Amino acid sequence: SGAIYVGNYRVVNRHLATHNDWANLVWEDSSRDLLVSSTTAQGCDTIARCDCQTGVYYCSSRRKHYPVSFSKPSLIFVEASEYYPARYQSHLMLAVGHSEPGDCGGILRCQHGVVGIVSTGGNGLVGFADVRDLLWLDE
């Protein structure tokens, strides 16, 4: 679990969106595993607008932050699950690091701000949905 709170927006993993997120829907994309909903209160977070490939992410299954080297946003194959058919997820960045299913929503940050959120993983791998290209989040 976890979300990004910026301005009057809440950014969450689309597969973890609540009834309230869908009732206050701004934008959603199954191919990116992202959903953005509107809020009444002003958010706490700021978004990075950079090309950083190193950062730090929060891992809930270890209650710890870890440093990572991550790949550029790209189209990566993701196995079928209860949430989605087998498909290519776009704007996904991979890194070597620990992750379990419940880790989705953990924030990845660089020196400039929020980069994205945990969205996939495997045996010693962790994948993040990029949000740096969503310029409308703060303007």
Ligand SMILES: CSc1ccc(Br)cc1CC(=O)N1C[C@@H](C(N)=O)CC[C@H]1C
């Ligand atoms: C941090 S997630 C994770 C980590 C380790 C291991 Br094994 C497995 C996962 C779970 C995972 O990759 N997905 C894919 C995700 C998606 N974006 O399609 C939807 C939830 C779930 C099925």
Ligand SMILES: [Zn+2]
């Ligand atoms: Zn950066």
